[PDB]
Structures are given as C-alpha cells and as structure tokens.
Curated annotation (Swiss-Prot), chain A:
Coiled-coil ranges per UniProt: 484-513
Name the UniProt record assigns to this protein: Polyketide synthase PksJ
Annotated function: Involved in some intermediate steps for the synthesis of the antibiotic polyketide bacillaene which is involved in secondary metabolism.
Cysteines joined through disulfide linkages: none
Length: 591, 597
C-alpha cells in the first residue's frame, strides 16, 4: 500500500565541497573540512572568553563554512539587483539549488509548469535580518518578503516554477531536512502532490547562535564532531545546502529518469517525556525505526549500513546505538547480519537545518561507488556503545560496501537507513534501497554568452576526467535536448564520439565546426519556420535524412526542433550532467 | 479513503475576548475590537509619519491586541520563573491554550501520556528576541530553547504531555493555522498519529512588522479590515491564540466526546505563478476548493456558509469571490434547488491574526453552528462593485440572521455545512469543510488544582457558569463524570455531593464565600495522606472494600477518601453507558507577569 519513491535528482554545496563531485571526493579521502570562523563572518578573537563565566563570550572558534554564501544570480530568477540585497541567503541558496537538482534530474522547467509539484525545505532564520539591524538600516517594504518570513523561500521558488503542490518550510531543528523528506514522501502518497523537491539550507551569519549554543553546552571545545569516539564532548556547527527531486518509482521507471535510490519507508515521531527537554529518548528512537522498516517491509538482516544522526555527544551517541540495537532486535522477533554505522558530521560538522539531507546524499554517494567511507575521529571507541553481540560495527576504516545474498542465491540491492534527531525531540528515519536497472546533435544554452561558455567548460572538464564513454553519447545528447531549458544564447555541434565532442567544445571555449546563435536575434528566421504544415514536413524530412548540421544551424537561431523524433519507441535514459553555472555575483547587506 | 475528523475541544483568546465565551458574545453583538496600539508595546506617535517618504515611520497606529501576552504559570509546566523570562510568549501562549483545549475536550493528561498524539501549531518569531537586544541583555544558554528556535514551542508541549506524535511548527504566513488543521487531519489518516492538537499563535511585540508591512502596502490606513466593502484598502494586524483537539469521528462517538463539528475534507496548494509574488490566483483558489469538496463528497448546494480569508484588500476580495463562483460552478457540473450561501469574515471583527488567522475563522464557524446563527460581517454596508453576487448562490452576511437548516430531496433536514478559507502572501492556500454534528440521583462533584488559590479560582469559574444558567439538572451527571475522568487529579482538592445544580451552587458558594465551613463539602491535600493511598491500592482486601462503597453509592465517604488522594474508579459508579463529556471552564492559570530581564 506504500508506493516507493525514486530519488531522480540531487544537488548540494558543503564545507570544503563546491559540488556533489567534490563532496564525494572529500568523503573518499576521509577529509576534515572544519576550519576556524572566517573573518568575513566575524572575528572570533573579538568574542573569545569562557562561556561559563564571561558575558557574551565563547571558546568556540570553529565551524564548517561553505563558499559563496553571498552569491546569487537574481536576473535568472526574475529579481532585481536592488531587491536581491534584501533577499535572505537562505532563500537565494534555496532557489539556486532547487534548480540544480532539477537539471541534474534532467527535468525541463517548462515541463514543470502547471504541475502539482510540492516543495519542502528545512529552513528558518539564521541572522540576515539581524545584520540589517546592526548596520542600523532603514526598515523597508522589501524586508517583509525579503528576510522576515522564512516560508517565502520555498514559496518564491513555487511562484517561479509555476507549481501548485504544497510549498512549505520545515523546521524541527536538526531533524528539519529529513522531516522534509518524510513530509514530501507522505504528500506523494495522499495526492497532495505528484512530484516533490525536498532538502535543507543552513547558514551561519552571526556569532549569536555560537555563543548561546556554547553556553547551552551543545558545542565541542575541540571544534570537531568526534562521533562514536571516547573523546565525544559535543558537536561543531556547519553550513550547507542539499536538494533532492522525488518521483514515484513507477513514474521514474516509466519516464526514463536516472535513479540514485529508492525510499522504501519513512518515519517521524517525538520523544515525548525524556530526562530533559533536550535529552534523546532511546525507546522512542527504537519505536521510530521499527515503524520505518515495517512500512518498508524488509528484513533487518539485509540492512547493511546506517547513517547515524551521530553528533558526537558523550551521552547521545550511546543512546542512539541502544535505539538501533533494540529496534533491530524487535524487528527480528516479529518475524549473520553485519551492519555498518557512520556519520558525515565527522567530515563536515553538524549542518543542523541541513543535517539530514547531508546524511542522505552521503548514503546515495556511498551506493553509487559501492563504498563505505571512513567515519572520522573514532580511532578509540566510546566504551558505552557495546557493539560486540550486536550486528553493528563502526566504520573506522574505508571499505568496499559488499552486497548480501538471498537464500535463493540471488544478489540483494544495498539497503541503508538515515537517522536525524532534533533537540526538541523530533525524530526522523529514512530507509533507502539501491536501485537495480552513429552521430547526434549536442546542444547547450544559457542566459548570456559568459554563462554559455561556463556551460561548455563544465561539460568539457567533465569529459576530460573520464566520466563517460561513447555509449553515453546519446544519453547526453537526449538529456541536453529535452532535459534543459532552451535559453537565448545557444551552442550546437554534431558529434559521434566523446573525442569528437571534446574537440569541438575545446574549439568553442578557446575562441575559434560548431554552430553559434541567439534566439532573439533571429525572429525573422523564426517566422519562416513557425506554424506551417509544409515547413513541418521539411523539418520532418531533415530529421529522417539525418541532416544534423542543418538542424543544429536552425536550432541556435531559436527554431523549435522536435528532438524526440530522432529516437525510437524507447528513449535513451536521462543522465546526470553539470547544472547551470549561475553568476557568482555578490549580494549582501546594503549601505 | 477519508476518515472524517471530529473537533472535540476548543480554546482561544482574541482581541477584546478573554475566552471563547466572550468571543461569541462580541461576534453576536457585531463588536469591533480594534484599538490603537497599546503604549506598553510601543508609542505610535514616536513612529508616526508617511511610510512612502519617511525613514522607519508609518501612519498605521491601530491593531488587534490581546490581554496578558506576558502572563504565564511556569511552575505548572515544570519551568523555573528564571527560565520563564527567556521563554517566548509564542511558546507560553501555546502551552497554556493547548492545555485549555484538552480540558475543554475532557481529555485527561494521564490518558494522553504515551499516546502518539501529534501537535501542529501556526507559529514563528514575533520579535521577543529583538526585545532582548534592545535592552542589551547578554546572550545566555537559555536563549537557545527559549526564543531562538520556534519548533521548541510545540516540542516543549509534546515533552510535557509525553506524546509521541509529530510535533511541528506550521509556518506558511497567513494560512499557517489552517494549513496546520490540514497537516493534522492528513497525519491522522496515514497513522502518523491517532489524535492531534492543531492551532495558531500570533503576537505583535515590536513595531518593526507594522512599519515594514505598511511600506509594503499591506495594511489599511483606516485600521479596519473592511472586507467585501468598496472602501477596502488593506488589513489591520491582530493578536491571538486558537486551539482545537481532533479525534477520528469513530472514536469520538464511541468514547463519549462532545463534538463541535466534523471535518469532512481539507486541501492545501500553492498559487504558482501569479501577476506578482503576493498576488492571489483565482484559478488556484478554485482548484483548491474543488479538491476539498470532492473529498468531502457533498453537494455544493448544501453548503450554506463560507468563512472567507477576507483580508479587506481592494484586489484580493473580488479574486476570492471569483475563486468561489468558479469552484461551485465546476462542482455543480458534477440535491437542493435555490442554492443560497452566505459569506463572511471574522477579520471584520478582530482583524487579521496572520499566524492565527485560519484558526480564528474555524472557531467563528464552530460558534455559529453551536448557536445556529450567521453573525454580521462588519464595515460592508456598501459592497465592492467587483463582487457581483446577484446571479450566484452567494450573498454577504451584512446583518445577523438565523443560520437556517436545509432539506434533502426527501422531507429531511440536513446538517449545516460550511467552509473556511485561508491564504498566505507567499501563495500557500488552504480550505476546510466543516459539517454540523447531529447527535433524580446524587453524584460527587470533584475539583483539584495546584494550590489553594487556583482551587478557589476553579470553584469561582464553575460557580459562575452555573449562575448564568448555561446548565440544567439534565447536565449534572455529565458535569460530574467530566470532572471525575476528564481532569488531572491535582494536589489541592475539593469535593461535595449534589443532586441538583442548585444544591451544587449553594455548596460551591459555601466554599467560595469564606471559609464558611461545617464542611458540607470536602477539603484535602493529596501529598499529606500517603500510606492511606498505598493501603487502598496495594492491598487486595481494602481494594474490595473500596469497590463496595462505590457500588453502594456511599457518596460522602468516597468524597472524603478522594480529597485525601485515594484513587477512585469512578466508572464503577455508572452503567455501561457513561454520560457524554461536557465543556467546562478550563484551568485558571496564574496571571504572573514574565518578560525580558
């Protein structure tokens, strides 16, 4: 009765990682990305002291910060540069990475127009309005939708994409982004929407949260999330953004989507009465997991990895493990298992509002490369874990993520779980299952010449590091033809090999074969082909006779081509390609 | 596959309305509760000017404000008075009225403990943290859960009630509280929870929003939501809190709940691309309504009232009407000829409660069903020429009138059916379909509270509600049973035996008046009579002795035992059919003032 949900597109930026590619690169190398507070945020020395004694002071000087938090391309999203200064980075990073996730999925925006597609994002206030305050800036009308109402974030994207599904901010503290997944998946089951975009955005803009959380005894004086370790003394704060596009497995299998993984079950609850308000409850975390896997209807012995919430607290880490053991014990009862446990927070810190979506993306990447990456700082384990009799073990060293085998001698899809818990007591768990499955015209378009060149370089430098072969050519061509918005500045070339394409892209970037045009400058050429049955026949013949160079020459001028007719009944499967290279223009608090 | 949901308990506080009872009194009188901005908030003269030209100035000086925004009983909820200063009034008002809603329903916290009951509240930052910075108060650890993270509001109450359902803040601007109803009802279908508490809380703590919203052109320079009027020029900001307890109708009828109304269908969408980001979409409002009434599976001609979003904007109101007309037309293209449906807006009475707007609309309708009356919509003596309702089933309720019943094809009256709309400036829309619910001997009346002061308050509340004849002798057992099994058993206890409301009134007054004790009522403290309690529970023979006294109706004796904290199984006092739970005055929390240190 539960319809499985396919993850057909992902995007994200993390500490020490510009994109998903570098994010995986850092996870494979077991890299630590936590640094000291950059001085463009605030000077830590100016607020340094002892939090237990010194007023308005903190000994926390670390954090996981991203790059280009102030960067935005407002004209792309129909916003003026003047109004862009009032727009919260939470909303700017939202729109930017929702779009990237759409392009990664190969979903043309024009296809989304009018659809009942939902948006659910982990977001909230992070201090942008507080920066306006400090600079003694005049209260303007733009502030209302700019940085006073967090729900405008997803709502603004819904307005931009012309989608009619539920459009909501999700704020359950550190569970927010994973609750968004649950909320989104739930919405697709009762028909509140057909497709969904879920994720989280977390930025660290002032020192206030650092000071308060420090005095609350939440943060590590070492500045590291030493999860599962015996040195666990708190967590380190992190920034980031992550998006996923969700489609029903039926539809994704039917529409030619590429799939990162399948969600077999979701679960959300509250810890009820615990020892304190901010104390995790292992009975509740146990019941949570049980509900998730019963919904998924999978046997626990097949679950081979768990992305823990794992913040690196002396008390919480053992509590989370107890919940896992009790859950899997009870699950076996109502019917040699070995299951790994890790935490990406050891790499990039606690992303809080974007914590859950970070763990999910890490898991998806772990499925892609069939590898269980190292969990950091846990060289010596917490003695209170008690993992010997249990199926569980901490991934202290990077290893292959082997598959297990049915009693019918058949291979099994890898299965993982992701947990995300909030200090308020809101818990969330997700169950992910691994998914088991002559020339063409290559087209590229952008808003201007510079962005087009950026697009080319992206595709160029992604062929150069050998991501694809010549069997992926038509999967690339098709995805670029039907899975990209047709913008004004256009570039087309004919290619049969990755070599040929690389040569021609290299030629365009360098400044020299290939076709080049602007859709708005050829409105006269556009009349002579638009709305005519005899022209339609002629175009139909060009496609049949494979006059690719001539077709490409028309397309760059803004002439519509039915790219579908180049292919048979079964279209090439959509493929992951570099998403839009937005302008890195600085937009911040005005003077 | 839609299980209807019953509203079994409500609570609230609105501009010029201390409680739900007074809220209805004002609506029935057509009272306007909008005032100028109170001075303990800010000085409107200090910030006056032309918002189009002057820096940080505004000509909007009105608003809908509630009383006791700073009041709280932190010891009741296990919070130190020191911590209470750091707790956002959003969270304080949340816990207070969530509890009041539970007591209204007759749901005891002991029964609720361990249940997967969810909470969904329209809430967010309202500026309490800003007041800290204005006083240059140092950043402390308490600030984190106190007023930095909105979700702690609902989460704290879930912690306090030991409930394990989803505990979320709902924030979609002016549709938050109604989206909360939708999110809650939705959660009760997929088994995320069995019961739910939905609502909203809205406080106006600084002048910042007044200024910014004014310069955004959102607010009326007359300070009135003149909904449906030709003078419509914006809305007036309002404060308030509203709560509802939701149960599946199946359980509500089985468990003996008293029901305010039934939710037959809900819906939530987004307007998508409109003319501007803050422009409503009549096509989207139409599709929303269609989905809702399809889910309810009711004939449009049976719907006789619509609580409009009705902000009193010049452009929004016609768009809302156009959405309605297109929706009922599309619904009639597929029971009652001569379809005639009323339209009204509580915004005309108390203004736009923003976060708490939707719940204020739901409660207005519930009251209208209770008294079978459509109250007057204010400020619309001259209708907006863009409405054009003549060739449609719709009319504006410009005068108070009886909410008349309608009849099916046979000779049978139908339950009253109404809808509530709530839209956000972000584009989030929500709609809810409500249906009217169609349903000597002595006893022990018991009352408990945290202290002797609250116990006297509890008595005064009950005593007075009797004297204003809200009750008859037909109700005495419903009262008794509700106080026996639908209240938390607290330390300071008062019990008396009564067979009539008169006998009860005289006994409560005897306790209230002085002193004045021959003790024809029973008084005691639970904590001072331990052992005696253990004796009667841990021993099999004393337990049977106690069971005997219940079955023999030894009222005065059980009363003596109960005020000493001895556990009485009140169900043994009744047959298999228990009396239906009844609405009674909820806990009289201490009005202790807590604000920034």
């Amino acid at each position: 009765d539960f319809e499985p949900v396919a993850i057909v597109g992902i995007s994200g930026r993390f500490p020490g990682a510009m994109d998903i590619d570098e994010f995986w690169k850092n996870l494979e190398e077991g890299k630590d990305s936590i640094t000291e507070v950059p001085k463009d945020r605030w000077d830590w020395r100016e607020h340094y002291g002892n939090p237990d004694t010194d007023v308005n002071k903190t000994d926390i000087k670390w954090g996981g910060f991203i790059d280009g938090v102030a960067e935005f391309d407002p004209l792309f999203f129909g916003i003026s540069p003047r109004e862009a200064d009032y727009v919260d980075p939470q909303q700017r990073l939202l729109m930017t990475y929702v779009w990237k996730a759409l392009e990664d999925a190969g979903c043309s925006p024009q296809s989304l127009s009018g659809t009942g597609t939902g948006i659910f994002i982990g977001t909230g206030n992070t201090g942008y309005k507080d920066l306006f305050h400090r600079a003694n800036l005049p209260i303007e009308g733009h502030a209302a939708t700019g940085h006073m109402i967090p729900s405008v974030g997803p709502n603004r994207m819904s307005y931009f994409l012309n989608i009619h599904g539920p459009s909501e901010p999700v704020e359950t503290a550190s569970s927010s982004s994973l609750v968004a997944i649950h909320r989104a998946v739930t919405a697709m089951q009762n028909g509140d929407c057909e497709m969904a975009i879920a994720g989280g955005v977390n930025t660290i803009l002032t020192e206030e949260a650092h000071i308060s959380y420090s005095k609350a005894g939440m943060l590590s004086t070492d500045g590291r999330c030493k999860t599962f370790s015996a040195d666990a003394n708190g967590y380190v704060r992190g920034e980031g953004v992550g998006m996923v596009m969700l489609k029903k497995l039926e539809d994704a299998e039917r529409d030619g989507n590429h799939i990162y993984g399948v969600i077999r079950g979701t679960a959300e609850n509250h810890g009820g009465r615990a020892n304190t308000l901010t104390s995790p409850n292992p009975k509740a975390q146990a019941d949570l997991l049980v509900r998730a896997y019963r919904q998924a209807d999978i046997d626990p012995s097949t679950v081979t990895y768990i992305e823990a919430h794992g913040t690196g607290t002396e008390l919480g880490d053992p509590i989370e493990i107890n919940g896992l053991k009790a859950a899997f014990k009870e699950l076996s009862n109502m019917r040699d298992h070995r299951c790994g446990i890790g935490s990406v927070k050891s790499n990039i810190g606690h992303l809080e509002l974007a914590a859950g979506i970070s763990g999910l993306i890490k898991v998806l990447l772990q499925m892609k490369h069939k590898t269980l990456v190292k969990s950091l700082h846990c060289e010596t384990l917490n003695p209170y874990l008690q993992l010997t009799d249990s199926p569980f073990y901490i991934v202290q060293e990077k290893q292959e993520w082997k598959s297990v085998t049915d009693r019918d001698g058949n291979e099994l899809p890898r299965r993982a779980g992701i947990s995300s818990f909030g200090i308020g007591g809101v818990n969330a768990h997700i169950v992910i299952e691994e998914y088991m499955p002559q020339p063409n015209v290559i087209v590229l378009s952008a808003k201007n010449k510079s962005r087009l060149i950026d697009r080319a370089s992206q595709l160029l430098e992604v062929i150069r590091n050998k991501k694809y072969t010549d069997q992926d050519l038509h999967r690339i061509a098709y995805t670029l033809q039907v899975g990209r918005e047709e913008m004004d500045e256009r570039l087309a070339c004919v290619a049969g090999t990755m070599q040929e394409l690389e040569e021609k892209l290299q030629a365009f970037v360098d400044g020299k074969e290939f076709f080049r045009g602007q859709s708005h400058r050829n409105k006269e050429t556009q009349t002579i082909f638009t709305a005519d049955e005899d022209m339609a026949l002629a175009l139909d013949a060009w496609i049949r006779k494979r006059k690719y160079a001539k077709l490409a020459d028309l397309w760059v001028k803004g002439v519509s081509i039915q790219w579908n007719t180049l292919y048979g009944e079964t279209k090439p499967r959509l493929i992951s390609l570099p998403s839009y290279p937005f302008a890195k223009d600085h937009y911040w608090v005005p003077a």
